Design a protein around this ligand. Structure first.
Ligand code: LU8
Ligand code: LU8
Ligand code: LU8
Ligand code: LU8
Lengths: 290, 286
């Protein structure tokens, strides 16, 4: 039995509800009929028992229901009342400890996705962004929305790109996604798209960390250089034509933590995808930063 | 706000196999059938789910879809398919202990042909559908409804435009000559299997006080759980086909059905009747 209590999000994706189940809050996503291939892909990903991780949104159930010509598509997960990282960063500043806890937790989730377990295939997310990261009461985050994920098994030489014509959130798309030169039959290509997007999320978080009494306001990546509601071509212009990267506020260079983070986000943003850091290397670097 | 009642009471197990189990269940005011998949057969749940996420099939001669459910457990994933419940059970079951008259035999086989033609046909536009081949048609995958018509079940191996049951495999599957890049190839494999089902049913139709006992196709030439090689020798090398008893040739309906089944069993897949032509032929019998 589930009771739908309130809508906590509505968009082109569908809707998410806070519900009650066995006396616990749960999140219930009802997909738009336009996004049925995301529902199925997310269901394929959550079939993997060894996907479970403290920094990946926890799955409870997936349903496809129908009577007559009407179909409903449901995903039920754990509920995080603090909401997404995008929501959280607009109303909170961070100290060093909280900033590093958040970004290490995301690195930990992403390295868990990317690294094959011999089981869980290697997984690239393809739509990493601050709205797809939830904040937990322990100060860590978990990564959500596996509808665009790609899976790879090294042991069997199999690449499963799925069938979904959805593309990533335009603001977070890597240069090779925006210029459509990405190597679509290469698993490493998709991991390197995630690394680009992770760099952008690092920047979004680091802006909110106070140093020397200074903090930046929350802004999304490329807020200063594209229109509101940027198109694919708007993003291609700034990233591929103009070679734009998010600006590093000069106040960061007075703080050792933010100086380390600036270095790390620049190594996520090389135009050459093979130059970018791995998720494991980011996790190891953040583990060593204080 | 909205209560989403998902509790299904599993009341009795009506099937157990390598596939997993089927249960009669209760949801609210509907009996439902619940297929709980074995780990062995997880791909069948994914394929049927992917198909129903692509096209919501609705046809009187297709087992009615209700839900696909995936539930997280401590150490495993539980996969359920929920459908309409047909208390009379499978055609295989039904033919063991029931004989048929002319009307009941024709109603059964025309309903199966109707369901199969619906799968096979591509319909264009909104409320259309891709062409579908079943790939495991047999009497255990057909349910009997109270109104005398049947419905086709189990789209776990279906293809849209982990091998089928060996006893029902067409010669081109057994000799590995099937044109695997040609969608029509898969329709023609279903037609072969349909012809075998038509033979199983026709045997149980009474004429002049005579009926055959229920037997499965090739019961007289292969063992139980026949091997791939056993089937290939019968169907491909020796080119055997099920026996038509002499008593059929005294009955106009069984004479017509014998001709139909032989046009489903040509070695050359492209010579076989289409499901639509089978329907037309069946509507002109009696
Ligand atoms: C999955 O299966 C079963 C489901 C249900 C069921 C329960 N609540 C609500 C609904 C429903 C209401 C309204 C719409 C539409 C109406 C028109 N437009 C506005 C789009 C929305 C759709 C669906 C249903 C269909 C009942 C069943 O049996 C009686 C089911 O079968 C077991
Ligand atoms: C990203 O993706 C998925 C997310 C979730 C999910 C899980 N816990 C909590 C939430 C949430 C709750 C509340 C808010 C607040 C934020 C501030 N604002 C002013 C009011 C609303 C935001 C977010 C969500 C959205 C579930 C999903 O599936 C069931 C997701 O899809 C995989
Ligand atoms: C998640 O899981 C299961 C759900 C159900 C089920 C139970 N009550 C009501 C529903 C329902 C149907 C349809 C709508 C429509 C209403 C109008 N429109 C604008 C959008 C949505 C709402 C609610 C469902 C789908 C049954 C199950 O089993 C038979 C489920 O488990 C497989
Ligand atoms: C072929 O495959 C599927 C079949 C079904 C299904 C649907 N209605 C009814 C049944 C059934 C009910 C009752 C009896 C017995 C019980 C009492 N008596 C001793 C003889 C009759 C047998 C069978 C089934 C098995 C559901 C499925 O999925 C949920 C199937 O898989 C796609």
């Amino acid at each position: 039995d589930i009771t739908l209590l309130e809508c906590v999000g509505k968009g082109r994706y569908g809707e998410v509800w806070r519900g009650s189940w066995q006396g616990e809050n749960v999140a219930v996503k009802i997909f738009s009929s336009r996004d049925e291939k995301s529902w199925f892909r997310e269901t394929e990903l959550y079939n993997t028992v060894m996907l479970r991780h403290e920094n990946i949104l926890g799955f409870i159930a997936s349903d496809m229901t129908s009577r007559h010509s009407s179909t409903q598509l449901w995903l039920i997960t754990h509920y995080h009342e603090m909401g997404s990282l995008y929501d959280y960063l607009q109303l909170t500043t961070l100290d060093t400890v909280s900033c590093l806890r958040i970004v290490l937790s995301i690195a930990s989730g992403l390295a868990h996705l990317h690294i094959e377990i011999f089981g869980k295939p290697a997984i690239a997310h393809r739509d990493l962004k601050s709205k797809n990261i939830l904040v937990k009461k322990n100060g860590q985050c978990c990564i959500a929305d596996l509808g665009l994920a790609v899976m790879h098994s090294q042991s069997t030489n199999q690449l499963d790109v799925g069938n979904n014509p959805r593309v990533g959130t335009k603001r977070y798309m890597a240069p090779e996604v925006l210029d459509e030169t990405i190597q679509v039959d290469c698993f490493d290509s998709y991991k390197r798209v995630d690394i680009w997007a992770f760099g952008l999320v690092l920047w979004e978080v680091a802006r909110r960390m106070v140093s020397n009494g200074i903090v930046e306001d929350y802004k999304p990546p490329f807020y200063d250089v594209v229109p509101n509601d940027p198109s694919f071509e708007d993003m291609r212009k700034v990233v591929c034509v103009d070679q734009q990267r998010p600006n590093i506020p000069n106040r960061w260079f007075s703080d050792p933590t933010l100086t380390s983070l600036a270095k790390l986000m620049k190594e996520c943003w090389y135009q050459n995808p093979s130059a970018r850091l791995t998720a494991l290397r980011i996790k190891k670097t953040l583990t060593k930063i204080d």
